[PDB]
Amino acid sequence: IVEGSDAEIGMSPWQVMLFRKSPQELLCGASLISDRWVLTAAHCLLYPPWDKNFTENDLLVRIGKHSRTRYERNIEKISMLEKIYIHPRYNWRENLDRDIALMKLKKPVAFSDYIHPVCLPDRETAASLLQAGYKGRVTGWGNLKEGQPSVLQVVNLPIVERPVCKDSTRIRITDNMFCAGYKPDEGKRGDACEGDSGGPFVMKSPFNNRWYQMGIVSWGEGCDRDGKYGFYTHVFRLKKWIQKVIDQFGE
Amino acid sequence: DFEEIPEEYL
Amino acid sequence: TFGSGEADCGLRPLFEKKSLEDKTERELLESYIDGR
Amino acid sequence: XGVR
């Protein structure tokens, strides 16, 4: 996260760490949607261009973390993935369209002060909060500079108009994405960065006070550059894919 | 700088 | 999980549950042209 | 773009 802050203890109880067994290392961010399911960017799994193609056995999921690096002894819980599900129409070939994936943990995780799921948005929550101008919050243990933080970082970013979004890049922007960041005039910064991927873009609902997961950190050009924005998977646009797998693979 | 993890995890 | 992650979803044990606000959540809510 |  670029130009963010040290998260407070239990500020983001849904943040997960996608951690590689060997070498032991932080792959990406993710989020707990229930005691058995994790949500991430498919590109954290699969990415042929870089010879990336992790299996269930190549990873570890770590929930309850604050500290980037230390093993937080009675606070964190490590899990073994049971299954991996990548959107069947994820586009690694052109724009990272549909960069979503689900993870079935091998045994449910017990909730605690530091571990608690985030709510998936319904058609109306989506419709009333997803408005340019509205701020959302991103989290992660990714680079601080377009370096590796000590503690979980947080940043609040305003949502940007589709058009401003399209004109800041040459990449083809689909309806499954949304961009965020401040405008250069706004003179306020912050962004996600390498290693931030898969983390949640969340919003607090003013109707019922619940945290909602609207986006998934997906991609961007550089990190915190004027005239450039962060791009996120639109969690609501793909809710039917999500609904559809939780009840076949059955969460 | 990663601390190792209980082996019951690997 | 379902349209809205768990069931007790999005209520933080250390903030929502003890009626405590995080240090920048106000920033957010004010933008929704001040929340709840 | 940089796939994050």
For residue A82, give the nearest of A48, A38, A142, A46 by alpha carbon: A38
Q: Are residues A59 and A181 in the same domain?
A: no
Domains of chain C, CATH where assigned: 1-36 (4.10.140.10)
Q: Which residues from chain A sit within 8 angstroms of residue D4, using beta carbons?
A: 28, 41, 43, 142, 192-197, 217-220
Long-range own/partner contacts, residues A49-58 (CB < 8 A, 24 or more apart)? A49/A92, A54/A20, A54/A27, A54/A84, A55/A84, A56/A80, A56/A81, A56/A82, A56/A83, A56/A84, A58/A20, A58/A21
Cβ(A141)–Cβ(A15) below 8 Å: no
Active site residue A197: yes
The DSSP element (H or E) to which C31 belongs, if any, is: helix C25-31
Q: In terms of C-beta density within 10 A (0-12 exposed, 13-18 middle, 19 or more buried), how is residue A198 classed?
A: buried
Q: Which residues from chain C sit within 8 angstroms of residue A35, using beta carbons?
A: 6
Amino acid at A161: E
Active site residue A34: no
- At CA A57, angle to CA A54 and CA A59, rounded to 5? 65
Give me the residue label for tokens 């951690």: A19
Between CA A247 and CA A181 the distance in angstroms is: 35
Deposited experimental method: X-ray
The total number of structural domains in chain A stands at: 2
A122 touching B (Cβ < 8 Å): no
**Resolution of this deposited model, Å:** 2.5
Q: Which residues from chain A sit within 8 angstroms of residue D3, using beta carbons?
A: 43, 47, 96, 99, 197, 218-219
Phi-psi region of A198 (alpha: psi -120 to 50; beta: other; left: phi over 0): left
Between CA A31 and CA A20 the distance in angstroms is: 17
Six-digit token pair at A96?
Answer: 């990272």
Phi-psi region of A235 (alpha: psi -120 to 50; beta: other; left: phi over 0): alpha
Q: Are residues A230 and A242 in the same domain?
A: no
Largest CA distance in chain A: 49
Domain that holds residue A179: 1-12+118-236
For residue A116, give the nearest of A15, A238, A25 by alpha carbon: A15
Q: Are residues A194 and A135 in the same domain?
A: yes
Chain breaks in chain B following residues, C–N > 2.5 Å = none
Q: Are residues A50 and A171 in the same domain?
A: no
Q: Are residues A123 and A225 in the same domain?
A: yes
Reported as half-sphere exposure (CB side, CA atoms, 13 A), residue A112 has a value of 12
Helices (H), chain A: 123-129, 162-166, 239-246
Between CA A112 and CA A63 the distance in angstroms is: 11
Q: Are residues A127 and A220 in the same domain?
A: yes
Q: What is the CATH number of the domain that holds A182?
A: 2.40.10.10
Active site residue A112: no
Phi-psi region of C13 (alpha: psi -120 to 50; beta: other; left: phi over 0): alpha
Cβ(A194)–Cβ(A218) below 8 Å: no
